[PDB]
Each structure stands twice: as C-alpha cells, then as structure tokens.
Scaffold this active site. Structure first.
Site, PDB file in Angstrom:
ATOM      1  N   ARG A 328      -4.838   3.070   8.347  1.00  0.00           N
ATOM      2  CA  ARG A 328      -4.716   1.579   7.669  1.00  0.00           C
ATOM      3  C   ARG A 328      -5.385   0.461   8.366  1.00  0.00           C
ATOM      4  O   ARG A 328      -4.958  -0.040   9.407  1.00  0.00           O
ATOM      5  CB  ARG A 328      -3.213   1.061   7.276  1.00  0.00           C
ATOM      6  CG  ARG A 328      -3.134   0.044   6.410  1.00  0.00           C
ATOM      7  CD  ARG A 328      -1.680  -0.255   5.732  1.00  0.00           C
ATOM      8  NE  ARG A 328      -0.412  -0.475   6.770  1.00  0.00           N
ATOM      9  CZ  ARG A 328       0.560  -0.936   6.341  1.00  0.00           C
ATOM     10  NH1 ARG A 328       0.667  -0.901   5.003  1.00  0.00           N
ATOM     11  NH2 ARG A 328       1.470  -1.139   7.264  1.00  0.00           N
ATOM     12  N   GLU A 421       0.259  -3.429  -4.106  1.00  0.00           N
ATOM     13  CA  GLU A 421       1.256  -4.580  -3.161  1.00  0.00           C
ATOM     14  C   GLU A 421       1.169  -5.782  -3.588  1.00  0.00           C
ATOM     15  O   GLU A 421       1.435  -6.671  -2.911  1.00  0.00           O
ATOM     16  CB  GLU A 421       1.405  -4.250  -1.883  1.00  0.00           C
ATOM     17  CG  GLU A 421       0.128  -4.237  -0.917  1.00  0.00           C
ATOM     18  CD  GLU A 421       0.428  -3.775   0.553  1.00  0.00           C
ATOM     19  OE1 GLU A 421      -0.890  -3.787   1.105  1.00  0.00           O
ATOM     20  OE2 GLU A 421       1.403  -3.582   1.203  1.00  0.00           O
ATOM     21  N   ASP A 449       5.350  -6.051   0.503  1.00  0.00           N
ATOM     22  CA  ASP A 449       4.382  -7.087   0.153  1.00  0.00           C
ATOM     23  C   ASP A 449       4.340  -7.412  -1.365  1.00  0.00           C
ATOM     24  O   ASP A 449       4.173  -8.735  -1.777  1.00  0.00           O
ATOM     25  CB  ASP A 449       3.246  -6.569   0.612  1.00  0.00           C
ATOM     26  CG  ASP A 449       2.563  -6.791   1.758  1.00  0.00           C
ATOM     27  OD1 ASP A 449       2.207  -5.922   2.608  1.00  0.00           O
ATOM     28  OD2 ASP A 449       2.547  -7.820   2.240  1.00  0.00           O
ATOM     29  N   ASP A 620       8.297  -5.759   9.623  1.00  0.00           N
ATOM     30  CA  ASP A 620       6.780  -5.909  10.171  1.00  0.00           C
ATOM     31  C   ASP A 620       6.536  -7.304   9.103  1.00  0.00           C
ATOM     32  O   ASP A 620       7.192  -7.829   8.573  1.00  0.00           O
ATOM     33  CB  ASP A 620       6.253  -4.795   9.749  1.00  0.00           C
ATOM     34  CG  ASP A 620       5.673  -4.451   8.406  1.00  0.00           C
ATOM     35  OD1 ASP A 620       5.997  -4.961   7.302  1.00  0.00           O
ATOM     36  OD2 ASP A 620       4.750  -3.301   8.476  1.00  0.00           O
TER      37      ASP A 620
HETATM   38  C1  LIG Z   1       7.870  -2.931   5.820  1.00  0.00           C
HETATM   39  C2  LIG Z   1       7.208  -1.861   6.569  1.00  0.00           C
HETATM   40  C3  LIG Z   1       8.176  -1.573   7.809  1.00  0.00           C
HETATM   41  C4  LIG Z   1       7.819  -0.569   8.795  1.00  0.00           C
HETATM   42  C5  LIG Z   1       6.616  -0.132   8.832  1.00  0.00           C
HETATM   43  C6  LIG Z   1       6.058   0.757   9.723  1.00  0.00           C
HETATM   44  C7  LIG Z   1       6.929   1.740  10.715  1.00  0.00           C
HETATM   45  C8  LIG Z   1       6.269   0.586  11.428  1.00  0.00           C
HETATM   46  C9  LIG Z   1       5.610  -0.369   7.849  1.00  0.00           C
HETATM   47  C10 LIG Z   1       6.151  -1.515   6.752  1.00  0.00           C
HETATM   48  C11 LIG Z   1       5.004  -1.513   5.599  1.00  0.00           C
HETATM   49  O1  LIG Z   1       3.788  -1.952   6.179  1.00  0.00           O
HETATM   50  C12 LIG Z   1       5.245  -1.549   4.059  1.00  0.00           C
HETATM   51  C13 LIG Z   1       4.369  -1.866   3.304  1.00  0.00           C
HETATM   52  O2  LIG Z   1       2.832  -2.042   3.426  1.00  0.00           O
HETATM   53  C14 LIG Z   1       4.814  -3.084   2.188  1.00  0.00           C
HETATM   54  O3  LIG Z   1       6.000  -2.699   1.436  1.00  0.00           O
HETATM   55  O4  LIG Z   1       4.068  -3.913   1.975  1.00  0.00           O
HETATM   56 MG   LIG Z   2       2.223  -3.884   2.724  1.00  0.00          MG
END
Ligand SMILES: Cc1ccc(C2CC2)cc1C(=O)/C=C(\O)C(=O)O
Ligand SMILES: [Mg+2]
Ligand SMILES: [Mg+2]
Length: 712
Positions: A328, A421, A449, A620
C-alpha cells in the site's frame, strides 16, 4: 549538506545510498538512468498532482458554501444532486464494460479468502504476516475467546485439557461442515489412510470416504499411515496433522495434533495509514523491509518455504507457503522532505512510493538466493488509497506507466488495488474502475476513511450522528452494496477481488466469527483482518459461504440508488441527552489521545487503544480521521463547547498515560509541554480546516517537531 543533486532534485543521502547499494543491484537498471528518471517523472507529473489537490479544495469550498446558504427543511435531494452535477463532483456514468487486467495471480482472480494488512516498518510483524498463509486453527481457537473461558475452560499458565477438548470438538464440527463424510462424523474418526488414491476415514464400526472425494487434495508421509491429510473446500486448503505422540494427539481419538487452515491468502504491506514515516530515515526503514520481503532474506525468524505434498494418485506437488504480497503506497496528498527541489519544496510522497516500491518489487519477480518470492505471473500489486474520483485514478495510471518506463518493465506490470474510501470515488465508482480497466486488481470499501470523508464533505450541513451510529446509516449500507454491484458489473468475478473492510476489535474474536461472515455473504471475495490469528478465524467464513455462488446470484442487480449514497448522516432534533454527549466526547478524546501519543512520541502508526468501554481497538489514521472530524463537527455546530473539548482531553490524558512503557513520556500534567497532547488538540480544533479532514499534515509536522526536540 546531507543531500545528493540529481537534476532539480536534492535527495537525502540515506535514501540515495539505500537505492544504489540495496534496491538497484540485481534489477539490471542503470543507476544513472534510474535517477534521471526520478528527476523527469517528478518534474513532469508534479503539476497535475497539485492541480488535482487544488480541485479537491475548490469542490469542497463550493459544497461548504452551498450548505451555508440553505435554510430549507431536510435536504432537497433533487437540488443537491443537480448542484453536484453542475460543479463536476457527480460525473456521468459510463456505458457497461468488462475489465481487461491480465497477468494476475490466482490468489487474486480466483481464490476467495482473508486479506491481512500489516505495517511494513515492523519487520517482525511483516514476517509473521507473510507467513500467515498457513495458520493453526487449534492455536486460534485455544488462544482467543472463540472458545468461551467459562467455568473449567479457562486459560492458565499450562494446557487446560477441558479447553483443549472444546477446541478439538469445534474443529471436528468445522470438518463435518466443510468436507463431509459419506456417513458418520469426523468426531468419531479413529484414523486416516489413502487407498487406491482415495481417502478412507476409519469409524468405530465401519469405514467411509468423503461425500465429495474431489475434496481430497493430498497427504504427507506413507499412504498407509499419512502424517497429514490435505483437503480443499471453496478453493481453500485444510490440513489435518496426524501425530499420536504429540501433546494434543495423545488425547485425540484419531491422533490428530492440529488442523491447519490456509488463512491469509494475500497480505498488504502498508506504507500508509498503519505506519508513521515522516522523513528519509523512516522511509528507508520501510523500503528496506519491503526489499527484504521481495528478496526473501528479511530476518528478525525468517520467511517460510513452499509446502510439499503427495497427490492423491501418488504424484508430487507443492503449494505456496507465503501470502501473496501487495504494497500500500501513500495517496496523492502528502509531500516528504526525503527529496526536495532547488527551491526547498518537498516532493510528492506518492510519486516517490511508486518509483521506490515499484523498483523494489522487481526483486519479488525473480529468484531469491530459491524460487521467486511473489508473483509468478509477472505483476506488481500496489494498493492506491484515498483517491477522489476518476481523474485521480487516471493520474495513478499515468504515474505507474511512467514508472514502468523508468524501470524498464512491461506496460501494465504495476497493478492497482483501488480503495473506495472517499465520497467522490463512491459516487463515480464505475468511472473510477473504467479509468483503471487494464490495471485494476481490486476494489475495497475502506469504510473508516469513507466515514471520515462523509463527515468532512458535509461538515457545514449540521451535526452528524454519533460515531457508533455511522456503521448502520443508510449512506454506508448503500455504499457497501454499490461497491459490490459495480465490481460484479465490471466483470470482477474470476478476474479481480471485491473486498470489504477491517475488523478492529482485536480481542473480540468470538464476535468476529459471529458477525464478519456478513462480508462474504455480501459477495466480497476478500476482507481485511488485523492479525494472523484473525486471518485463520476469518477463513472459517469462506468455508461456510460459497462466495463464487453468491457473486453469481448478485449479477445484474442494482441495489443502491445515487439518492441513497448521498444521504448525509445528519442527527435528528434533540437526539442526545447530556450523558450521551459526554460519553461520545470522552470516547473520541481517549481514542485520539491513545493513538496520537504513540504516533508523535514513538513513531508507531498502529496501536491497540482501549476505548471508553475497555474494548481494545486497533487504531490507525482512518479511525483517527473519524474521531477528530466528528468532534470538529460537533464543535462547529454547537453540540459541545471548546471548554468541553479541553476538559475531556485533560481528563482522558492521565488515563492514557497510565495505560502506557520505556520510551513513554507522560502527557499530564504539563499538557502544553507535550507535543503529542498539542497534536491531539490541534487535530480537533483545526480539524474543520484540514484538507478533506486528513490527519497527516498535523501528525507529520508534530512528529518532526518531536524528533527535532529529541535531537538535543
Ligand atoms: C482502520 C485500520 C486499522 C488497522 C489497519 C492495519 C492492521 C494495522 C488498517 C486499517 C485501515 O487502513 C483501513 C482502511 O484503509 C480504511 O477503512 O480506511
Ligand atoms: Mg483507508
Ligand atoms: Mg460449498
């Protein structure tokens, strides 16, 4: 200085040296030609990158104004829709089409199963995630609350046989449900043998085979008494390990030691929302781990080799031992001073990630000093997050095309996993897919997001519902269905992944097993998990749900209207009592503070942070985006005062200080002396002014401020 001049660019020496000494050798790319290509791509594409960001700002300015100039009752949807079409936010929907992406691995085109995301800056976690292609079901069941810790079944310092027996029984029922016997139950099995290329399971009174003998995929050891039996269901492998001498096998009626599930089919190595990387030193740490993964020599513990099996008929074969890796990259917003130009301006970070992660991924297409680590079909898989609309997708495609030329790769080697997103992508999703019709390998509803963008886009419209209400609001339910519909209509079945979002309650594994089944039931061929353990448990859902069949049944259906997608999550009149507002503020402040303190002071981009209900949540930047935008919105509309915000931050900060720790600096009581506390405050009080509500500008500035103070 500490910089290297190449054309108009001034490259941090640590990054220049890493690329020349580590990333470039073995790719046959000429070092001088590579750096000339970096200079030329940055110069050529930076104007369009900036113009796209400027277009976001102008569209949002118009939307803000539009809401401020209305007095009417609920939103006149017909007027709103024609306004969004007028300003170019809502674009025409293109005619039907089928994607043409080729050279994609079976893990993406065909296999339905879990997708694990891990911060690339943590070498140990990244290694475990790559190795998470196979995981022990017994460990995942024994170690989590999937088996309740009821009276007599609690975990202790040593093995609890009552609990172990519940684990065994759970796994036997899974086998009965997934690979049924012609008669009888696996719970009564007493042994396994391979006879004339067929699996034979001994029962107490009789013997039986599989109801579908095609689910027997192989074995290890002597066909007379195999050391393991390999099964397949819905394209995912199940391995029964047979060892009566083991601690568990000694207690088992058939000597079974464990059941191993193919779990994390693919893994996303993350440079974005789960990592904190604010300069060249941080980026190089991430790039070096991505390099070690692709060369196969990353070691903290090491990467697993492929798995050897004997076929049912007797021949030999092998199965992938590692998760297929995506990376990513960061999105279009941020710059990074790892490279600056002659004016001192920082270079766009997404442009750099495309060049450097693309360069490094070449190593995963070639033999590792054994077999090549990653894509046997010749693709590089890049998740591109936070895009707003089809012109931004087209720009990613042009960037990838120009990078391919610099790297000497075939055009379309670099494939795109599109995050859905951002609202302007959601409402133009078909056009976004079309813009990448020969590169796209997935769409995925990054719903956290997406919720952040929902709040910011409509910030001026009024107070929004509480954060916990958002997951059930009409807009988000329409967004999830619309994403599946668009993917299937573009021919994703058999060609690309339709993905759904992350489970964040890392300790609530019973709840995950009970509820996350909704995602494959909705036709998603993959969904996001936070750990290898959760990948193994989420794999159970793909044995229960036939995603291929679900997708075929969904074909041709249009289950979401544009009006539904555009339903803004405004709270109704008089929605909350004072105790409910208090809990929402305190909960959001605790999650903000718990995440931001480890970000700013320790450079940790993903942390488990207990919430106000003591539930451990993996946070995050996207969950931070939601919490900070919601409080910004409530402050903007008079739901809470600035005194309410400050008091909550000051009350929750000492609790966060207690939850933390060798490199931990307490935030309280000297709040204005803590860069982390001030960052948390700024994310709320300046949240309405951040571009699309993004948290990186503040986080990056404050982390760099912290590093500077620490260096004296
Ligand atoms: C929300 C989230 C928590 C943890 C992790 C990784 C395991 C550490 C990634 C995400 C995330 O980036 C999701 C999406 O991109 C988005 O729902 O926007
Ligand atoms: Mg995201
Ligand atoms: Mg089935």
């Amino acid at each position: 200085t500490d910089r290297v001049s190449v054309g108009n660019l001034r490259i941090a020496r640590v990054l220049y040296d890493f690329v020349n000494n580590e990333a470039l050798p073995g790719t046959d790319i000429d070092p001088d030609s590579f750096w000339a290509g970096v200079d030329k791509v940055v110069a050529d594409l930076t104007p369009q990158n900036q113009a796209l960001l400027n277009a976001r700002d102008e569209l949002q300015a118009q939307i803000d104004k539009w809401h401020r100039r209305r007095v009417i009752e609920p939103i006149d949807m017909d007027a709103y829709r024609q306004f969004l079409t007028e300003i170019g936010y809502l674009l025409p929907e293109p005619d039907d089409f089928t994607i043409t992406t080729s050279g994609v691995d079976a893990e993406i085109t065909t296999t339905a199963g879990p997708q694990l995301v891990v911060p690339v800056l943590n070498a140990r976690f990244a290694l475990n995630a790559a190795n998470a292609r196979w995981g022990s079901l017994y460990d995942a069941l024994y170690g989590t609350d999937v088996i309740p810790e009821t009276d007599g079944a609690e975990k202790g310092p040593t093995y609890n046989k009552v609990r172990g027996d519940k684990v065994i029984a759970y796994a036997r029922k899974f086998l009965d449900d997934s690979v049924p016997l012609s008669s009888g139950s696996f719970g009564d099995a007493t042994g396994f043998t391979v006879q004339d290329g067929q699996l034979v399971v001994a029962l107490p009174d009789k013997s039986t085979g599989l109801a579908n003998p095609g689910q027997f995929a192989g074995y290890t050891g002597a066909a007379e008494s195999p050391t393991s039996v390999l099964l397949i269901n819905h394209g995912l492998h199940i391995e029964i390990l047979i060892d009566p001498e083991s601690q568990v096998g000694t207690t088992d009626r058939a000597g079974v030691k464990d059941v191993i599930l193919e779990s994390a089919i693919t893994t996303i190595m993350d440079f974005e929302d789960s990592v904190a990387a604010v300069d060249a030193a941080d980026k190089v740490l991430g790039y070096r781990n991505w390099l070690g993964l692709n060369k196969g020599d990353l070691a903290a513990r090491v990467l697993n080799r492929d798995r050897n099996y004997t076929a049912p008929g007797g021949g030999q074969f092998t199965l992938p031992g590692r998760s297929l890796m995506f990376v990513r990259n960061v999105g279009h917003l941020m710059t990074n001073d790892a490279i600056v130009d002659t004016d001192g301006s920082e270079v766009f970070e997404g442009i750099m990630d495309a060049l450097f992660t693309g360069l490094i991924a070449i190593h995963g297409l070639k033999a590792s000093d054994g077999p090549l680590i990653n894509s046997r079909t010749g693709s590089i898989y890049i998740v591109k997050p936070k895009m707003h609309g089809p012109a931004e997708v087209a720009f990613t495609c042009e960037l990838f095309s120009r990078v391919e030329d610099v790297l000497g790769l075939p055009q379309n080697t670099m494939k795109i996993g599109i995050m859905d997103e951002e609202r302007r992508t959601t409402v133009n999703l078909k056009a976004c897919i079309k813009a990448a019709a020969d590169r796209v390998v997935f769409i995925n509803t990054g719903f956290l997001d997406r919720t952040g963008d929902e709040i910011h886009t409509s910030m001026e419209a009024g107070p929004m519902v509480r954060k916990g209400t958002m997951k059930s609001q009409p807009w988000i339910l329409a967004y999830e269905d619309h994403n599946v519909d668009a993917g299937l209509a573009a021919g994703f079945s058999g060609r690309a992944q339709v993905g759904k979002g992350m489970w964040t309650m890392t300790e609530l594994m019973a709840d995950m097993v009970e509820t996350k089944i909704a995602q494959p039931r909705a036709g998603a061929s993959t969904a996001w998990v936070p750990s290898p353990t959760a990948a193994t448990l989420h794999a159970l859902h793909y044995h229960q749900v036939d995603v291929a069949a679900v997708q075929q049944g969904l074909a041709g259906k249009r289950r979401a209207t544009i009006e539904q997608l555009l339903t803004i999550p405004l709270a109704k009149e008089l929605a909350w009592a004072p105790d409910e507002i208090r809990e929402e503020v305190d909960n959001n402040c605790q999650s903000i503070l718990g995440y931001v303190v480890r970000w700013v002071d320790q450079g940790v981009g993903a942390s488990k942070v207990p919430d106000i209900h003591d539930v451990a949540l993996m946070e995050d930047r996207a969950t931070l985006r939601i919490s900070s935008q919601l409080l910004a919105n409530w402050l903007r509309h008079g739901v809470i005062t600035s005194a309410d915000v400050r008091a909550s931050l000051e009350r929750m900060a000492p609790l966060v200080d207690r939850q933390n720790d060798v490199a931990y600096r307490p935030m309280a009581p000297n709040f204005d002396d803590s860069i982390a506390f001030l960052a948390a405050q700024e994310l709320i009080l300046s949240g309405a002014q951040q571009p699309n509500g993004y948290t990186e500008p503040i986080l990056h500035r404050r982390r760099r401020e912290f590093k500077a103070r620490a260096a004296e």
